[PDB]
């Protein structure tokens, strides 16, 4: 938890390039992270869901903008 990934002591102490790869691949498995509680798990998921919905609306707004600006609608 002193190096990346801070959510996994076991990975943060690996001295190989593996530490990087696994960190990236385990970032969204919030149940397995060090010190996770159930309440914090639900709260972090809620916030991540807001982020995902923001991404969706940005994508739709971008489709609309590019058609309006550069399309032949």
């Amino acid at each position: 938890a002193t190096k990346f990934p801070k959510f996994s002591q076991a990975l943060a102490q690996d001295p190989a390039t593996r530490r990087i790869w696994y960190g990236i691949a385990t970032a969204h498995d919030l149940e397995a992270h060090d010190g996770m509680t159930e309440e914090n798990l639900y709260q972090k998921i809620f916030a991540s869901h807001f982020g995902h919905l923001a991404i969706i609306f940005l994508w739709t707004s971008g489709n609309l903008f590019h058609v309006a600006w550069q399309g032949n609608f």
Partner: protein, 80 residues
């Protein structure tokens, strides 16, 4: 470091200890079986996780179990 556990079905055949390439295991006195000895893993810091010990174990199911965990230089078998 990997985790190595000995369960009480061990018959003290010493085969896992002879199989270990990094000397993780040793035989210790015990009254639970006829042979009067059980396997032990006092040096799990040197376990590479090859599972030769499990291949050598004659019980059903295994009496020695290696659970792979946090990797170190020693457990990754690195000469560098």
């Amino acid at each position: 470091s990997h985790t190595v556990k000995i369960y009480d079905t061990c018959i003290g055949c010493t085969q896992c200890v002879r199989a270990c390439p990094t000397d993780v295991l040793e035989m210790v006195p015990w009254d639970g079986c006829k042979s009067g000895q059980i396997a032990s893993s006092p040096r799990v810091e040197d376990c590479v996780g090859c599972k030769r010990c499990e291949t050598a174990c004659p019980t059903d199911f295994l009496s020695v179990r290696v659970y792979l965990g946090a990797e170190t230089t020693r457990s990754l078998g690195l000469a560098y």
